[PDB]
Amino acid sequence: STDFNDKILNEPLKHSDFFNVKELFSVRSLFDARVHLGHKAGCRHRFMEPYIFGSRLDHDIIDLEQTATHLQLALNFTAHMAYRKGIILFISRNRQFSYLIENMARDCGEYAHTRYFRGGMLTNARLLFGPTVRLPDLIIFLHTLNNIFEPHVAVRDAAKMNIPTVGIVDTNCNPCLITYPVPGNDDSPLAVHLYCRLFQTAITRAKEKRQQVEALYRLQ
Amino acid sequence: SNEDLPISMENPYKEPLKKCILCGKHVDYKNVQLLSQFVSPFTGCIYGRHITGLCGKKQKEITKAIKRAQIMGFMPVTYKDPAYLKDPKVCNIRYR
Amino acid sequence: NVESFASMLRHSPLTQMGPAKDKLVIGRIFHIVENDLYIDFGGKFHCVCRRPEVDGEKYQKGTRVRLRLLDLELTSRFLGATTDTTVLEANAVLLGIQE
Amino acid sequence: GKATDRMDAFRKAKNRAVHHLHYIERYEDHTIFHDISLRFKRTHIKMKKQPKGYGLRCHRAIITICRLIGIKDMYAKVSGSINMLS
Amino acid sequence: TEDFIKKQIEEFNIGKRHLANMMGEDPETFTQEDIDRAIAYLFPSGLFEKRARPVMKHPEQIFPRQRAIQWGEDGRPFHYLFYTGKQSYYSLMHDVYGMLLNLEKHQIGSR
Amino acid sequence: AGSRLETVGSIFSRTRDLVRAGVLKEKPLWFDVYDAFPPLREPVFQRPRVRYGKAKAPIQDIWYHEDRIRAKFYSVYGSGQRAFDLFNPNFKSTCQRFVEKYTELQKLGETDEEKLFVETGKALLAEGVILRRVG
């Protein structure tokens, strides 16, 4: 058990990019997906200024260099969690992409909550689901805002319950409590599809690498 | 250093600042024809700027000119002079 | 020699376009609900136009059409609001179909 | 804790507290790292770091909370409103 | 629980054989209608509410449908929509929506 | 018994402090990954404020030198009849072709703005571009 854990769990933590997530994307791919388009300058959020490249005719432009760095970190974290077999829950209240996100979750073997987030799903989880339920080990927000342009209550609840949160934060979002913010465009279908594909690929790579490493260790 | 970085300038696409129809033109208490274009045909009331579409300065000029003409005998007070009822309408009022 | 974000932004068609007012763009109907056509035209948002009474059947998912943009995003501030209310969709006029 | 019954109130409060634990840094495990002057609403708390063996010279409630935290030596003056919750 | 229901089913089979023996009928061809008739005869109750009367039914009919535990030993739930709290309902909605999308892409008897 | 004080520190700091204190017996699954590859900013809650006095947002409008040429082109000739195709990353509008021709003419060593404008218009006409003036 000791050696197994030491060589399985802690081995990947010794490498900058163990799962090679940087190859999954490039600044050009994000640009082509339009990850760099934000809302009007009037909708801008005070905490999203550091990630905004500028304002092109009252339209904010998200610094895709910072997006690339943040996306690297978020994808690496997600890959490591999937490798460690944690529960990854995808949250998004964008009804335009509810179906897509649910399908991505089902395909990648993780969970999704794209519906009306009932109060207490995380803070009252033991009562709602059962005393032995296992809460998600990572929450990935494809849209950190609810359908009234307020932060998803899941963000606050995840911070409360100490569940790390990856999250795509647009120029009108509040990245303060999101553990791994990925400044980007969460409203374009192209951008949302790119995010879904990236997270799906990273999680699948992590799971398959976990299986491969386990087989390598157990066969010897 | 880098040429693709944005440069600090003004907005070359800025649309012109809309000018009131009287901008640059001299409102005179003797130009009763012009003054009557901003008084109700039926009651003689001076239209507000939400009807005339005039800047504040030109609205004040028009009002002062109308009052001065009315008290100096150039303009009727209670109605628009019938001679000017058929002048180019420039007021956003539709009674019918 | 790898294009940077600055270069990409400078040379992007959207940046090359000035204000999106009265600009003729090519949209693509990606979703239709009754007579409402949701058209994506390369912006951050889509425009929901109305199936023209003439040649209405010709407007189907995937159809490429001509729009005259009026605003990439429909936002505005209202009395007492701290941040702009946005309807999360562009404003455009459907001029017909591109062939 | 709010309850129609005192014991239920006690249970609610003490069970909710453990889910809202702070962690307090103690200098040498007996006092605070530096003097702290703060105002929460209308209550001013002026806490002074003190040497070993000085004791807790604090409002009785602060003495209780410091014994819980693990602070042995500190001075504390409470000015303004003495509202217990604030 | 499942083991409890299994024990109840075994009890019901044994009791059904016993009741068939008591009434003299063939244990093999003893049906639920026969069981109900035999119980109504042996334990006559005039209670108006039929549910309050004695009943010897299958445990499946007696006990309510208990939802099985929704996660395994590792703790990971089974259904990807588990955390919605209404996994079955939202799965049905998701399937209906998928069918509607496919239909949109391609193209007095009941209540 | 993870602290539910999302306003006091970050999840990492609270988890670390509770583990140090002994409240948490075992580190949560994500703690090692976080400690190995932390985010660029520690996620500590911050209450947003509204700027009040002379403070202004540091966002700077994205302008380029060619924006002047684009504005002049649109003011002189209007949008045109060739509708933009924003899906193509290499799409070039009539305005962009005019901008390129103006830029190369400037490189040739001409400084007069109106002369550059008229020369570019004539050059595009020669190339076969129907530059229709709005007025």
Ligand code: FES
């Ligand atoms: S618009 Fe120029 S003075 Fe009124």
Ligand SMILES: [Mg+2]
């Ligand atoms: Mg958005």
